[PDB]
Structure 1
Amino acid sequence: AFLPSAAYLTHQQKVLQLYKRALRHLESRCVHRDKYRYFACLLRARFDEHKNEKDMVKATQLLREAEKEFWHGQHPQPYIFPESPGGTSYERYECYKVPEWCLDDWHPSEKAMYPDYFAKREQWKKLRRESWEREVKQLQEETPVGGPRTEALPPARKQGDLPPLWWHIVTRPRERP
């Protein structure tokens, strides 16, 4: 479907995703632990019965009828984790995730309350502006002609330099700011 590094989903990936969704929905229908354990073992036996099938069209039809079976017997509202999308506390703390570039607009009167922190911030910014040209030069010669094929980034090959495009995924805000 929508993948950063791959253009498609393999057959085994589809089977594993179906297995996880079916087990989660069966846990939702079977709220007690022992009952869920019993029916999870039954579902695991059903999945292991057709594990060794070499016919591609037959495995595809088995997957399609399994997806139809899951859609007929899904929970009207399954159990979603609190931080998972669709959860009760999903994206709750996004109002407190202030980006780090707002510290450059602070008044010097309130910058004096944290001298050592702002010194460390200054040396971090010095490191970033020193490494930017090296990392973009590394990225320029590693992309094949015609643009990149996937969205994966390369690491730093030699010693001393940081991986390319590292700033906004290292300085991201914490989960609980």
Structure 2
Amino acid sequence: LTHQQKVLRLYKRALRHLESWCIHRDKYRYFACLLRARFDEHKNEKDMVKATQLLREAEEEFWHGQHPQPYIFPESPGGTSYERYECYKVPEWCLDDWHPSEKAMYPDYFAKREQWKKLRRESWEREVKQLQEETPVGGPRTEALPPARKQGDLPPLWWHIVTRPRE
């Protein structure tokens, strides 16, 4: 993380912590531009300690008095009912063993199920042809070419390209 974008990680949560405490909507909305004037103290300057002392005093009065049980937007890392839908929980590929008269239903769905597998069954003449080439030695985050230079299939095929939908 860099020093300039360290301002941005605080700036969104500076106002996000405030609407936890408000009672109206305009009461929170009146303090948006009102807090903006403090942000408009040093508009554009150098990147040295003058920009760090604006953040070094943003240690206090940001963590100091921070969010007394705030809003959480319940579908989140925290919050209630964040992972509540777990009786279903999307067991993708639980459907290998059937021993049919249980595979009687959905006839066209299984006919398409084996169809997509040939896209995964034939990708390593193309994906592994660039997997040895795109990585220089052992370097950074290893996504492929996002078109794979002819046809990107996927590169992340198929557990990510057919990833779990929510309900």
| TM > 0.5 | yes
Q: Is the 8 A contact 1:97 1:173 kept in 2?
A: no
Report the CA distance between 1:156 and its aligned residue: 1.8
Q: 1:165 to 1:136 in 2, by over 3 A?
A: farther
Report the CA distance between 1:87 and its aligned residue: 1.2
- 1:23-78 deviations in Å (ceiling 9; x for gaps): 01111111311100111111112112222222511111211211322011212211
Moved more, 92-101 or 166-175: 166-175
Q: Distance in 1 between matches of 2:131 and 2:143?
A: 12
Report the CA distance between 1:159 and its aligned residue: 3.4
Q: Is the 8 A contact 2:135 2:142 kept in 1?
A: no
Q: TM-score, normalised by structure 2?
A: 0.86
Q: Is the 8 A contact 1:26 1:36 kept in 2?
A: yes
Q: 1:119 to 1:20 in 2, by over 3 A?
A: same
Q: 1:61 to 1:165 in 2, by over 3 A?
A: farther
Greater RCO (Cα-Cα under 8 Å, separation 6 or more): 1
Q: Is the 8 A contact 2:74 2:80 kept in 1?
A: yes
Percentage of identical aligned residues: 98
Report the CA distance between 1:149 and its aligned residue: 5.5
Show structure 1 runs of 5+ residues with no match.
1-8
Show structure 2 runs of 5+ residues with no match.
none
Q: Distance in 1 between matches of 2:68 and 2:143?
A: 36
- Moved runs in structure 1, 4+ residues, more than 6 A? 150-153
Q: TM-score, normalised by structure 1?
A: 0.82
Report the CA distance between 1:146 and its aligned residue: 3.1
Q: 1:92 to 1:169 in 2, by over 3 A?
A: farther
Q: Distance in 2 between matches of 1:84 and 1:161?
A: 31
Moved more, 148-157 or 116-125: 148-157
Pairs within 5 Å for 1:155-166: 155-159=147-151, 161-166=153-158
Which structure has greater helix proportion? 1
Report the CA distance between 1:166 and its aligned residue: 4.6
Q: Distance in 1 between matches of 2:20 and 2:145?
A: 39
Q: 1:149 to 1:164 in 2, by over 3 A?
A: closer
Q: Distance in 2 between matches of 1:119 and 1:72?
A: 61
Q: Is the 8 A contact 2:123 2:153 kept in 1?
A: yes
